[PDB]
Design an enzyme around this catalytic site. Structure first.
Site, short mmCIF file in Angstrom:
data_model
loop_
_atom_site.label_atom_id
_atom_site.label_comp_id
_atom_site.label_asym_id
_atom_site.label_seq_id
_atom_site.Cartn_x
_atom_site.Cartn_y
_atom_site.Cartn_z
N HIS A 234 130.77 31.53 -31.35
CA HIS A 234 130.76 30.70 -30.16
C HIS A 234 130.90 31.65 -28.97
O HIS A 234 131.78 32.49 -28.94
CB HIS A 234 131.96 29.75 -30.29
CG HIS A 234 132.20 28.84 -29.13
ND1 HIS A 234 132.50 29.29 -27.86
CD2 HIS A 234 132.29 27.48 -29.07
CE1 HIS A 234 132.72 28.26 -27.07
NE2 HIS A 234 132.60 27.15 -27.77
N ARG A 277 126.06 28.48 -28.96
CA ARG A 277 126.04 28.67 -30.40
C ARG A 277 124.60 28.56 -30.84
O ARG A 277 123.78 27.92 -30.16
CB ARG A 277 126.83 27.56 -31.10
CG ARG A 277 128.32 27.57 -30.87
CD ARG A 277 128.99 26.43 -31.68
NE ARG A 277 129.35 25.26 -30.87
CZ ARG A 277 129.67 24.07 -31.38
NH1 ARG A 277 129.68 23.88 -32.70
NH2 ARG A 277 130.00 23.07 -30.57
N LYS A 280 122.11 25.28 -30.50
CA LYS A 280 122.62 24.30 -29.54
C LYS A 280 121.89 24.49 -28.21
O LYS A 280 121.03 25.35 -28.10
CB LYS A 280 124.16 24.36 -29.40
CG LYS A 280 124.87 23.80 -30.64
CD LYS A 280 126.37 23.58 -30.40
CE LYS A 280 126.63 22.63 -29.21
NZ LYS A 280 126.52 21.23 -29.65
N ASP A 283 123.03 26.19 -21.43
CA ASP A 283 124.07 25.70 -20.54
C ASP A 283 124.40 26.80 -19.55
O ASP A 283 124.70 27.92 -19.95
CB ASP A 283 125.31 25.29 -21.35
CG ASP A 283 126.49 24.85 -20.47
OD1 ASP A 283 127.42 24.25 -21.03
OD2 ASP A 283 126.53 25.11 -19.26
N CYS A 285 126.96 27.65 -17.84
CA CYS A 285 128.21 28.41 -17.87
C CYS A 285 128.13 29.59 -18.86
O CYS A 285 128.83 30.59 -18.69
CB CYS A 285 129.43 27.51 -18.16
SG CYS A 285 129.47 26.80 -19.82
N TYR A 286 127.28 29.48 -19.88
CA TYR A 286 127.10 30.61 -20.82
C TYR A 286 126.35 31.78 -20.19
O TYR A 286 126.27 32.85 -20.79
CB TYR A 286 126.47 30.16 -22.17
CG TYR A 286 127.45 29.30 -22.93
CD1 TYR A 286 127.30 27.92 -22.98
CD2 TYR A 286 128.55 29.86 -23.54
CE1 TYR A 286 128.23 27.12 -23.65
CE2 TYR A 286 129.49 29.08 -24.21
CZ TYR A 286 129.32 27.72 -24.26
OH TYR A 286 130.25 26.96 -24.94
N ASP A 338 125.55 22.75 -15.44
CA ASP A 338 125.17 23.05 -16.82
C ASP A 338 123.64 23.15 -17.00
O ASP A 338 123.10 24.19 -17.41
CB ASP A 338 125.82 21.95 -17.67
CG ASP A 338 125.32 21.89 -19.09
OD1 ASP A 338 124.31 22.52 -19.45
OD2 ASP A 338 125.98 21.15 -19.85
N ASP A 345 130.24 20.68 -10.97
CA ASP A 345 131.68 20.76 -11.07
C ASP A 345 132.05 22.19 -10.70
O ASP A 345 131.18 23.06 -10.66
CB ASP A 345 132.16 20.34 -12.47
CG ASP A 345 131.66 21.27 -13.56
OD1 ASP A 345 132.01 22.47 -13.52
OD2 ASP A 345 130.91 20.79 -14.45
N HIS A 348 131.39 25.03 -13.55
CA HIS A 348 130.00 25.53 -13.62
C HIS A 348 129.60 26.30 -12.37
O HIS A 348 128.81 27.24 -12.45
CB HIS A 348 128.99 24.42 -13.96
CG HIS A 348 129.04 24.01 -15.40
ND1 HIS A 348 129.74 22.90 -15.83
CD2 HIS A 348 128.54 24.61 -16.51
CE1 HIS A 348 129.65 22.83 -17.15
NE2 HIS A 348 128.93 23.85 -17.59
C1 LIG Z 1 133.66 27.75 -22.54
C2 LIG Z 1 134.78 27.99 -23.50
C3 LIG Z 1 135.18 29.29 -23.75
C4 LIG Z 1 136.21 29.57 -24.64
C5 LIG Z 1 136.85 28.51 -25.27
C6 LIG Z 1 136.47 27.20 -25.01
C7 LIG Z 1 135.44 26.92 -24.11
S1 LIG Z 1 135.05 25.37 -23.85
O1 LIG Z 1 135.55 24.60 -25.02
O2 LIG Z 1 133.57 25.21 -23.73
N1 LIG Z 1 135.82 24.66 -22.58
C8 LIG Z 1 135.01 24.25 -21.39
C9 LIG Z 1 135.16 22.73 -21.20
N2 LIG Z 1 134.07 22.23 -20.33
C10 LIG Z 1 133.10 21.35 -20.91
C11 LIG Z 1 131.71 21.88 -20.84
C12 LIG Z 1 131.43 23.11 -20.25
N3 LIG Z 1 130.09 23.21 -20.38
C13 LIG Z 1 129.59 22.11 -21.03
N4 LIG Z 1 130.61 21.28 -21.31
C14 LIG Z 1 130.51 19.96 -22.00
C15 LIG Z 1 134.40 21.95 -18.98
C16 LIG Z 1 135.53 22.51 -18.40
C17 LIG Z 1 135.82 22.26 -17.06
C18 LIG Z 1 134.97 21.48 -16.29
C19 LIG Z 1 135.25 21.28 -15.05
N5 LIG Z 1 135.51 21.15 -13.92
C20 LIG Z 1 133.81 20.94 -16.86
C21 LIG Z 1 133.53 21.18 -18.20
C22 LIG Z 1 137.14 25.30 -22.36
C23 LIG Z 1 137.42 25.91 -20.99
C24 LIG Z 1 138.94 25.84 -20.92
C25 LIG Z 1 139.54 26.71 -19.83
N6 LIG Z 1 138.97 28.04 -20.00
C26 LIG Z 1 139.66 29.04 -20.37
O3 LIG Z 1 140.86 29.01 -20.63
O4 LIG Z 1 138.98 30.30 -20.47
C27 LIG Z 1 139.56 31.49 -20.99
C28 LIG Z 1 140.13 31.15 -22.35
C29 LIG Z 1 138.46 32.53 -21.03
C30 LIG Z 1 140.70 32.01 -20.13
C31 LIG Z 1 137.54 28.12 -19.73
C32 LIG Z 1 136.91 27.35 -20.90
ZN LIG Z 2 128.85 24.60 -19.54
#
Ligand SMILES: Cc1ccccc1S(=O)(=O)N(CCN(Cc1cncn1C)c1ccc(C#N)cc1)CC1CCN(C(=O)OC(C)(C)C)CC1
Ligand SMILES: [Zn+2]
Ligand SMILES: OC[C@H]1O[C@@](CO)(O[C@H]2O[C@H](CO)[C@@H](O)[C@H](O)[C@H]2O)[C@@H](O)[C@@H]1O
EC number: 2.5.1.58
Lengths: 410, 315
Positions: A234, A277, A280, A283, A285-286, A338, A345, A348
């Site tokens: 991931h 991944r 998938k 996006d 943010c990646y 995204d 947001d 992103h």
């Molecule tokens: C990307 C990631 C990286 C490592 C572990 C988990 C994830 S994640 O599951 O995709 N998720 C992102 C949840 N996400 C959901 C998402 C992101 N992209 C698509 N989706 C559905 C969000 C978050 C905030 C907002 C806002 N505002 C909108 C969407 C978790 C966030 C939690 C807080 N984060 C975080 O703690 O990042 C560290 C660990 C690098 C310090 C950034 C990542």
């Molecule tokens: Zn994203």
């Protein structure tokens, strides 16, 4: 070549159509969803082409700035879902402003410091809001935000003695860390801990005993890293794992060959952005979590004397990533997202911009090579691929804290 | 008792049974930032939550209050931690709490706190009996839910529930052979049960994967799994595989097949293969084809591989 007012794009080449999904006439949920995205994205790409006229792409800096500036003070009840993530809002917004080279007024900076002080726990670390228990994620965000501000006032907010005790209070015998007291374990915690401990000069010889080995156990058969051993590779957890190992100077604990092949495979041939991944969807943010691995891998391989490394480019398609971000990930109202059809947001906005900056700027040793797609004003400030704050902020903070002793330790 | 959306819901500040404790407002400071203008209902619950937290009141009323605070923001890990303190302190029925977390996860299946809470309950009860079926229901709604897979792996490993998982993997691969989470689960199950050192198991797995590739040749997951189960011994240790792939090349020259050939050639050169000049030439030709035509998104990677091959094997 072309006149300065037309710039041919990779995603608009006629051969680019060959990159559309081939589903082998076998439809599954995965292929149906991927085809839907590609259809939308092709429509978007086409909107930027006028036969042989291809105007330069524009990062809508002023719109993004106004959206960010507003968010930094006040938010509607629609943001209640982030009430345990307020230091994140501080970090995402401040880092976006930093990338955009928008100054932070002294009054705003002081107010952010004051608020983050209120989020700091008496037990060490920072919580999601005033009076909340500490947690490694808002601790990471708060420390990064304070370093972006970078004043002595900001640095001194951090209770380093309690911070170190708090990290100890989360450390497990197998090398892993809890995200918070009584909380879950995954590779996020190793990165949060390593990031804040290295910035603030609180690393002890024992703090990270076993941690590098635990992270290596999270690398899987695909070559990327899962949240815990056994789990699917991931991009987010992979960024966490590799970045933590870079801080620990233990990158060689991984199979860097399989990691490199995995991450480069995550760039989408059609969209130009990255997926999190295998199999998938793309996006924005990646653009950071995946593409940011390439500068880390470059540094790691360079440290090993790799004679084949480029002296000018990261090992991903820098131009294609910029095209995906600029054409597909900007909200016309300001903010980034995204993919087309999604709502903006601040998260992103932060990571799309961070990924854009990585794509624009290559540096290794004395070599610097920029590739800024579109109008020259698109150039962002550089970001540090380990910490994701400006490299100037990293140097300034690390220099400041190195002048302080490791709390209770010599 | 009464839910936040219920027509008879009353604000905590209006409840007689709460009259004896003063609410504790959030202090955001004199000059607030990232300030959320909360709804009245949200602020009311959280003002009372701060009060019980501050007093460390371990009461049934505090327990019921956490349910409302969670509905309002289920990402509030402080509330979850306190709810667990109360579960223990009040000796609450953990099976009832399991019914609760079941409903909550169904509503918010992508939330870290809800999954962690469930794991804690299962640990406390040492009862995994509902887990595989519950997870399968979540996966039926989103077959790639990362939290659901992670919890599934934990339950299987902790309670040794391996017996039926390969059958479950097979069912999900039939449903969507592109589901990378399921290929990962396949590796998880096999590596932890028989292992891949059993040559009969490895052959079964190589055969199965090649069959999936034949059915859907542009499915990257099957290609990645094929490499995954062979790479540690070394792709060049499997001479028949090269021949088989070379036969398919003229009719199925996908970037996945061509990349796999380069990976084989790389390993061959690393192991003193016969006809090294020839193999190097073939590998460089494929790197060029990938960089220029078949996999141009990865031009920089393929150019790197070509230079790397030359740095290691030119002689
Ligand atoms: C990307 C990631 C990286 C490592 C572990 C988990 C994830 S994640 O599951 O995709 N998720 C992102 C949840 N996400 C959901 C998402 C992101 N992209 C698509 N989706 C559905 C969000 C978050 C905030 C907002 C806002 N505002 C909108 C969407 C978790 C966030 C939690 C807080 N984060 C975080 O703690 O990042 C560290 C660990 C690098 C310090 C950034 C990542
Ligand atoms: Zn994203
Ligand atoms: O990507 C393969 C690479 O990862 C390592 C760990 O650094 O092992 C992972 O992958 C193996 C399969 O190739 C698994 O057996 C192992 O459990 C997993 O950690 C390296 O050993 C391997 O070369």
């Amino acid at each position: 070549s072309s006149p300065v007012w037309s710039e041919p794009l990779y995603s608009l080449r006629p051969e680019h159509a060959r990159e559309r999904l081939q589903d082998d006439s076998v439809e599954t949920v995965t292929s149906i969803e991927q085809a839907k995205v590609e259809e939308k994205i092709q429509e978007v790409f086409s909107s930027y082409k006028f036969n042989h006229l291809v105007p330069r792409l524009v990062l809508q800096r002023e719109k993004h700035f106004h959206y960010l500036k507003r968010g930094l003070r006040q938010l509607t009840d629609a943001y209640e879902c982030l009430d345990a993530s307020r230091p994140w809002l501080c970090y995402w917004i401040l880092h976006s402003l930093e990338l955009l080279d928008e100054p932070i007024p002294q009054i705003v900076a002081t107010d952010v410091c004051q608020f983050l002080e209120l989020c700091q726990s008496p037990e060490g670390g920072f919580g999601g809001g005033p009076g909340q228990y500490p947690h490694l994620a808002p601790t990471y965000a708060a420390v990064n935000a304070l370093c972006i501000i970078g004043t002595e006032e900001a640095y001194d907010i951090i209770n380093r003695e309690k911070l170190l005790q708090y990290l100890y209070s989360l450390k497990q015998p197998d090398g892993s860390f809890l995200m918070h007291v009584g909380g879950e374990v995954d590779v996020r915690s190793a990165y949060c801990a390593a990031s804040v401990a290295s910035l603030t000069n609180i690393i002890t010889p024992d703090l990270f005993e076993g941690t590098a080995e635990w992270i290596a156990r999270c690398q899987n058969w695909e070559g990327g890293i899962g949240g815990v051993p056994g789990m699917e590779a991931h991009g987010g957890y992979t960024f966490c794992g590799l970045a933590a190992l870079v801080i620990l100077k233990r990158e060689r604990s991984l199979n860097l060959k399989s990691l490199l092949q995995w991450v480069t495979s995550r760039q989408m041939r059609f969209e130009g952005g990255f997926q999190g991944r295998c199999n998938k969807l793309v996006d924005g943010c990646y653009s950071f979590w995946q593409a940011g691995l390439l500068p880390l891998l470059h540094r790691a391989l360079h440290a090993q004397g790799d004679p084949a490394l480029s002296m000018s480019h990261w090992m991903f398609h820098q131009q294609a990533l910029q095209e995906y971000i600029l054409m597909c990930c900007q909200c016309p109202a300001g903010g980034l997202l995204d993919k087309p059809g999604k709502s903006r947001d601040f998260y992103h906005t932060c990571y799309c911009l961070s990924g854009l900056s990585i794509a624009q700027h290559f540096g290794s040793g004395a070599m610097l090579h920029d590739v800024v797609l579109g109008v020259p004003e698109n150039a962002l400030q550089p970001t540090h691929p380990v910490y994701n704050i400006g490299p100037d902020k990293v140097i300034q903070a690390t220099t400041y804290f190195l002048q302080k002793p490791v709390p209770g330790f010599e | 008792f009464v839910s936040l959306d219920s027509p008879s819901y009353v604000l905590y500040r209006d409840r007689a049974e709460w009259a004896d404790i003063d609410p504790v407002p959030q202090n955001d400071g004199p000059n607030p930032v990232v300030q959320i203008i909360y709804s009245d209902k949200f602020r009311d619950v959280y003002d009372y939550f701060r009060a019980v937290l501050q007093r460390d009141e371990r009461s049934e009323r505090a327990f019921k209050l956490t349910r409302d605070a969670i509905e309002l923001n289920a990402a509030n890990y402080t509330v979850w931690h306190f709810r667990r303190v109360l579960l223990k302190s009040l000796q609450k029925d953990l099976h009832e709490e399991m019914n609760y977390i079941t409903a909550i996860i169904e509503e918010q299946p992508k939330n870290y706190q809800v999954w962690h809470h469930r794991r804690v309950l299962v640990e406390w009860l040492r009862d995994p009996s509902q887990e595989l079926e519950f997870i399968a229901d979540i996966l039926n709604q989103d077959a790639k839910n990362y939290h659901a897979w992670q919890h599934r792996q934990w339950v299987i490993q902790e309670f040794k529930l391996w017996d039926n998982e390969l059958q479950y993997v097979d069912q999900l691969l039939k449903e969507d052979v592109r589901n990378n989470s399921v290929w990962n689960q396949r590796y998880f199950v096999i590596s932890n049960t028989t292992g891949y050192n059993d040559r009969a198991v490895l052959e079964r797995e190589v055969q199965y994967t090649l069959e999936m590739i034949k059915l859907v040749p542009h499915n990257e997951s099957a290609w990645n799994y094929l490499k995954g189960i062979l790479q540690d011994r070394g792709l060049s240790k499997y001479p028949n595989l090269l021949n088989q792939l070379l036969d398919l090349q003229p009719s199925h020259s996908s970037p996945y097949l061509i990349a796999f050939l380069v990976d084989i050639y790389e390993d061959m050169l690393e192991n003193q293969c016969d006809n090294k000049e020839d193999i190097l030439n073939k590998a460089l030709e494929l790197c060029e084809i990938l960089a220029k035509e078949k996999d141009t998104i990865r031009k920089e990677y393929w150019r790197y591989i070509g230079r790397s091959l030359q740095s290691k094997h030119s002689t």
